Amino acid sequence: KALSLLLFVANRPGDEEETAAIQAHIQQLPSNFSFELKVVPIGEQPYLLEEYKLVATPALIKVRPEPRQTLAGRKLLQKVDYWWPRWQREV
Amino acid sequence: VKKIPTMIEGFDDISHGGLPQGATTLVSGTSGTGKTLFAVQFLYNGITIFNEPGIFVTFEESPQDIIKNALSFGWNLQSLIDQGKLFILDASPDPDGQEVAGDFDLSALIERIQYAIRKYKATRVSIDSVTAVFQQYDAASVVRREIFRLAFRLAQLGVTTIMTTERVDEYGPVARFGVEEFVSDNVVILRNVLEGERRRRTVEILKLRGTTHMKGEYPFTINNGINIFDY
C-alpha cells in the first residue's frame, strides 16, 4: 500500500523464466514498509497499457508514491537498484 | 494483388489503384514535405468516403496538436473520435520520466496498436514519424527489428498502414537509419525543392510491390489536402 509497482512484460520465448527471476530480485530488496509489485501481462490489460503510454518492454512503473516513474529495458533492475534507496516514502 | 483508394487527388492515378491493400507503405520525405499531411488524409478519406475507421499512431506530435493543426483544412478530427471512427494512439514520450536501460522490444506498442485495431474495427493505420522512435531509443538495430515485426502484425490483421519516415537530404538515401531495407515493398518519396523563390513539391512512387505505377516525380500542391497534377 505504501509503494506499488507494476511489471509489464511480454510473453515471447524466455520471458517466462526471466520475469519470475527479476520479480524475486525486487521482492528481496530491503524495505520496512509494505509494497505490492504486481506483474501485469501486457496481453490481458490493454486499458492499462494506454494509461501509462507504454511502448518499450519490459517496464516497471512506480505508481503509488508520486512522482510516478517508469523503468524499462531488460536491465531495469539496475535502475530499480539505483532508485530503491530514494523510494524511502514515509507517508 | 489489390489496392485500396486513398482518395488523395491524383495519387490513385499514379499508384494505378491506390496503396497495396493489407500492407504498409513507406512515406519518406524531409521536413515540411507533406508526410504527416499525407498520413492524415489517408485516414481522413478512409473514414469520410468509406465507413472504414482508422488508427493514428503518433510518436512526436501531441494528439491535440494533431487535431488542432488539422482544422486548417476543415477536418474536424475531434468529431471523428466522438463517433468512434478515429483513434489517436499517443506513443509520444514522457518528459523526464521515460528511462530505458538495456535491451528492449516494442511489444507493448505492438499490443497497443493491435488492441486499438480490434476495438475500433479499423482497416487503415498511420504511424507518424518512424524516424522518431529511432531518435528516442538509442538502439538502432533493436528498433529496426521491431518495426519489421510491427509491419507483420499490421499485415496479419489485414489493415493497410502508412509509416512516415524522415529523410537526410531531398535527393539522397531513401530513409534515415535504413527502414527502407525492412519495409521494402512500398516506398513513396515526397520532396520540396526551393529554387530561388519558387517552391516545387513533387511526389514519386519508388516501389509498389511490383504492381504497376507511374515513374518519376509528379508535382503536387497543398489546397485542403494533397493534389497531384502531372499525368
C-alpha cell at B55: 488508427
C-alpha cell at B136: 528516442
Q: Where are the alpha helices (DSSP H) in B164-222?
A: none
Give the three-state DSSP class for B75: coil
Cα–Cα distance between B212 and B14 in angstroms, integer? 9
Cα–Cα distance between B57 and B112 in angstroms, integer? 10
Burial class (CB in 10 A: 0-12, 13-18, 19+), B134: buried
Give the three-state DSSP class for B51: coil
Cα–Cα distance between A74 and B149 in angstroms, integer? 19
Chain A residues with CB-CB distance to B under 8 A? 8, 10, 12, 42-43, 46, 49-50, 53-59, 67-76, 78-79
Experimental approach: X-ray
Q: Which residues contact A5 (CB under 8 A, 6 or more apart)?
A: A26, A35, A36, A37, A38, A60, A61, A62, A63
Per the structure, the count of domains in chain A is 1
Give the residue from chain B lying closest to A56, CA to CA: B106
Give the three-state DSSP class for B129: coil
B143: nearest Cα among A78, A73, A41, A6: A73
Kindly list the distances between the CA atom of residue B135 and the CA atoms of B39, B132, B144, in Å, as whole numbers in the listed order.
20, 5, 12
Four-point Cα dihedral B127, B130, B133, B135, nearest 10: -150
Cα–Cα distance between B72 and B90 in angstroms, integer? 21
Cα–Cα distance between B167 and A10 in angstroms, integer? 32
Give the residue from chain B lying closest to A7, CA to CA: B108
**CB A5, CB A65: distance < 8 Å:** no
DSSP 8-state class, residue A36: -
What residues are paired with B189 via a beta bridge? B28, B204
Show the domain range for A20: 1-91
Cα–Cα distance between B217 and B205 in angstroms, integer? 8
Rounded to the nearest 10 degrees, the angle between the axes of helix A15-27 and helix A76-83 is: 10
